[PDB]
Design an enzyme around this catalytic site. Structure first.
Site, PDB file in Angstrom:
ATOM      1  N   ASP A 189       0.864  -1.535  -0.181  1.00 57.20           N
ATOM      2  CA  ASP A 189      -0.346  -0.425   0.267  1.00 57.20           C
ATOM      3  C   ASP A 189       0.911   0.797  -0.127  1.00 57.20           C
ATOM      4  OD1 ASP A 189      -2.631  -0.986   0.066  1.00 57.20           O
ATOM      5  OD2 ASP A 189      -2.224  -1.986   1.636  1.00 57.20           O
ATOM      6  N   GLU A 219     -11.232   0.571  -3.371  1.00 55.30           N
ATOM      7  CA  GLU A 219     -10.176   0.954  -2.340  1.00 55.30           C
ATOM      8  C   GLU A 219      -9.192   1.545  -2.688  1.00 55.30           C
ATOM      9  OE1 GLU A 219      -8.910  -2.934  -0.028  1.00 55.30           O
ATOM     10  OE2 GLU A 219      -8.516  -3.475  -2.344  1.00 55.30           O
TER      11      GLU A 219
END
Length: 504
Positions: free
Chosen positions: A16, A171
């Site tokens: 991420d 997301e």
């Protein structure tokens, strides 16, 4: 050099990624899940070579990891720079949810948490006109609001702005403004083989948004990516080059036989074409490669992990990580410059913080080793090196105190309901023991050296420690540890160095 680089740009457990530009400096953060300190923080001048300068979450007051594991704790973080202030915004799913911390100096101790009202995960900030806009993904909708990032007060109602192209698990939202358009970049498809990056735009920050006809802009999920050694490309963040070029950082992983990965999701770099009034196009065809034969910003090498780390400075570098919130008093440095670990009865399978401190495995092919001097030990006290994925999934190599003032080397595999003693070998009464772990893509290999003789202890498959097997959101770490078999024990172990060498 102005041409060519290797991916991943930050190998091993570094998922991420989010990046910001502050002048000629780039700063990048990763998710860290159950590990402490949390949110590793990197610096670069070229987007290729990264130095770990610290971690954003360095104090227990910033990071409650009670009961955290590879499926919980700290999820995706976002880093932004505005008007001399750095902000890192993330979610502690084991704790009170969305929050940020801030600083004017990325190398310092960052602020206490500022808790935020809007829910979901994957929070991100965008700044314009003296306003701070927050996005996150509650109930699968990207929601937008305005916040005061110092007080945490939400200043406008949350508005649903987009829910993606239709793919699963929308997301990682980020807003950018370019050429009079608000661009909204997200991830879809899940963070496994279907991972993809999609993008939409609107003339208004609050929508409505229209998707790029060419979506997805990055994926290895399709025919064009099916044979790649890299899979699961997604969770991107766009950033401008110092020369006006465009780039994205993203996560992906390197697959192993049977469709496994043990090095976690790692940080990759891709060039982006972004002409005036055009949609962005990622590396021509929305794929990336291990060898990227492309023009770069002027390159500048950075400090990496030493092949032999010693403890003579009386401090651990930012690379070292503990499970959950550690007991700080059980990690000390001796007068002669060794790391001393104090035993507790907490094992590596108890779902609590053991006396355990680790480095991420960053190569398929590597050798790691450490000398271990176990002292003041009762029967069954042990210390050594663990190849660790989760509390139910780890391979332990250790020196053990036995009855009658004898000692042995043991090798134990924890896999769910199996605790398998592969080897239990008697040691000579005298001689310092060095424990050795090697790997290739197929096996971990274990051994030890004492009185000048190296002994092979056998091998074990890598796949049983993969994310696909074990579950969760992390990669393998290599941890020094000590566990006592009594409460009455005063045991401790000294480690003079930790050696780690990866093959490129």
């Amino acid at each position: 050099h102005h041409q060519g680089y290797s991916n991943p740009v930050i190998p091993g457990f570094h998922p991420d990624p989010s990046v910001c530009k502050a002048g000629d400096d780039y700063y990048l953060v990763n998710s860290s899940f159950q590990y402490f300190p949390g949110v590793p923080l990197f610096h670069s001048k070229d987007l290729v070579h990264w130095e770990q300068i610290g971690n954003c979450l360095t104090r227990p007051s910033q990071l409650d990891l009670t009961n955290a594991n590879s499926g919980s704790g700290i999820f995706a973080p976002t880093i932004r720079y505005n008007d001399g202030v750095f902000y890192m915004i993330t979610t502690n799913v084991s704790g009170k949810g969305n929050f940020l911390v801030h600083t004017t100096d990325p190398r310092s101790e960052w602020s206490e948490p500022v808790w935020l009202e809007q829910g979901g995960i994957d929070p991100s900030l965008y700044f314009e006109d003296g306003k701070c806009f927050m996005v996150s993904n509650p109930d699968g909708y990207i929601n937008l609001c305005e916040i005061d990032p110092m007080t945490g007060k939400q200043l406008s109602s949350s508005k649903r702005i987009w829910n993606g192209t239709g793919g699963r698990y929308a997301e990682g939202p980020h807003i950018y403004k370019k050429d009079g358009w608000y661009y909204l970049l997200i991830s879809e498809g899940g963070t496994e083989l279907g991972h993809k990056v999609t993008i939409a735009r609107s003339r208004y920050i609050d929508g409505p948004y229209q998707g790029n006809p060419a979506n997805p802009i990055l994926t290895h999920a399709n025919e064009s990516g099916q044979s790649s050694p890299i899979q699961g490309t997604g969770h991107a963040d766009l950033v401008e080059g110092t020369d006006g070029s465009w780039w994205m950082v993203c996560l992906a992983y390197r697959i192993m036989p049977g469709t496994h990965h043990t090095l976690g999701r790692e940080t990759y770099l891709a060039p982006v074409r972004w002409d005036k009034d055009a949609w962005p196009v990622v590396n021509s065809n929305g794929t990336i490669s291990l060898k990227m034969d492309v023009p770069t910003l002027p390159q500048q090498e950075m400090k990496g992990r030493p092949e032999r780390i010693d403890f003579k400075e009386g401090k651990l570098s930012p690379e070292w990580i503990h499970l959950q919130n550690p007991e700080a008093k059980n990690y000390i440095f001796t007068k002669d410059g060794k790391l001393r670990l104090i035993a507790t009865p907490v094992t590596l399978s108890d779902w609590k913080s053991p006396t355990f401190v680790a480095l991420r495995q960053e190569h398929f092919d590597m050798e790691a080793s450490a000398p271990v001097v176990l002292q003041k030990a009762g029967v069954n006290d042990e210390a050594g090196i663990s190849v660790f994925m989760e509390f139910h999934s780890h391979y332990d190599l250790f020196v053990r105190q036995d009855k009658d003032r004898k000692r042995s080397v043991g090798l134990r595999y924890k896999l769910g309901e199996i605790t398998h003693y592969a080897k239990e070998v008697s040691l000579p009464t005298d001689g310092e023991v060095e424990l050795v772990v090697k790997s290739d893509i197929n096996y971990y290999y274990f051994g030890y050296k004492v009185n000048g003789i190296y002994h092979d202890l056998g091998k074990m498959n890598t796949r049983y420690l993969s994310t696909e097997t074990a579950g969760g959101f992390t990669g393998v770490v290599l941890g020094l540890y000590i566990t006592s078999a009594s409460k009455d024990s005063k045991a401790y172990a000294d480690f003079e160095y930790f050696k780690y060498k990866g093959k490129p």
